[PDB]
C-alpha cells in the first residue's frame, strides 16, 4: 500500500533485514550449540562416578 516509492523503501528494508536476521539467528544458535556440547561433556563426567544401578539407569 502507499506510493511506489514507499513500496521500494519497504522492499529494500525487508531484503536487508532478512539477510541480517538470517546471519544473527545462525550466530546465536551456534553459541547455543557450543554450550550444548559443554553440557553433554558434563553428563559424561557424571557417568564416570556412577555407583549403583539405579543411578546409571
Amino acid at each position: 500500500n502507499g506510493s511506489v516509492a514507499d513500496m521500494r523503501r519497504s522492499i529494500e528494508e525487508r531484503s536487508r533485514t532478512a539477510a541480517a536476521t538470517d546471519k544473527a539467528v545462525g550466530l546465536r544458535a551456534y553459541e547455543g550449540a557450543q554450550q550444548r556440547l559443554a553440557q553433554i561433556e558434563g553428563l559424561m563426567d557424571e557417568i564416570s562416578r556412577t555407583q549403583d544401578q539405579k543411578a546409571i539407569e
Binding site: S3, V4, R8, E12
Partner: protein, 272 residues
Amino acid sequence: AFELFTPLFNKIDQTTATYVTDISSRAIAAITPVVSVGLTLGFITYGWLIIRGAVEMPVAEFLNRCLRIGIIVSIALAGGLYQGEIANAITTVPDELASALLGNPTQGASAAALVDQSAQQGFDRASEAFEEAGFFSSDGLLYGLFGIIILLATGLLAAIGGAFLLLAKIALALLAGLGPLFILALIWQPTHRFFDQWAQQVLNYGLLIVLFAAVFGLLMQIFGSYMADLRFDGAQNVAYAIGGSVILSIVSIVLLMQLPSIASGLAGGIGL
C-alpha cells in the same frame, strides 16, 4: 544540473570573438589613422591637380564624388565598432527566444540555458528510469530500455537545435569578420557581385538564427515541461508517457529540419 548548451555557446562565442572579431577590430584600428591622413592628403592633392591642369568639374562632380567616397569609407570604418555588433547578435538570440512567442514572464534567461534546463528534465527522467532498472536486478532492463529511449530522444532534439544555433553563430562571426573585404567590393563594378553574395549569405544566416531561436525555444520548452511532468508512479501509463516523449521529439526534429530550407529560400527570394 544539465548544462551543455551554455558552455558550448560560450566556447564558440569566445573562439569567434578572439579570432574573427578581434582580428578585424585590431586590423581596422591599426589602419584607421594612416588611411584617414592618406585620404585627406590625397583629396587635397587631387583638388590642386584638377584646379591646375587636370580635367575637372570643379563644384558638382568633384565635391559629389568626394562625398560619396567619404561616406562609404566612414561607414566601412564604422566596422571598427565590432564588439557592438557581436554583442548585438549574442543578445538578439535570447531576447527573441525568451518571451516573443512563449508568452511567459522571463527572468532574463538565454538560449543555451533554456536548452540545458529542458534537456536536464529529460535526462532526469532517464536517470529515474535507470534507478528503477537498478532496483529490479533482473526484470529491470526494461527500465534500462525506457531510459535509453528517453535519453536518445532528449539528446537528439537538443543536439539538432543547438547545432544549428552554433552553425548560425559561427557563420555570422565569419561573415562579420570578412565584411570589410566585401564592403570594399562596391568600389569597382566587377566586384559588385561579391558584395551581393556576401549580403545574401548574411541574410540567410540571420533568418536562420531568428527562426531557430524562436521555434527551438518554443519546442524545447514544451518538451521540457512534458518531461518534467513524467513520473514512473502507479498512476501514469508508461507506454503513453514514453510514446508522448518520442512523438514530441520527432515532431520537433522534423519541424526544425524544414527550417534551413525555409531560411535559404527566403534569402534567395529577396533579390540582392
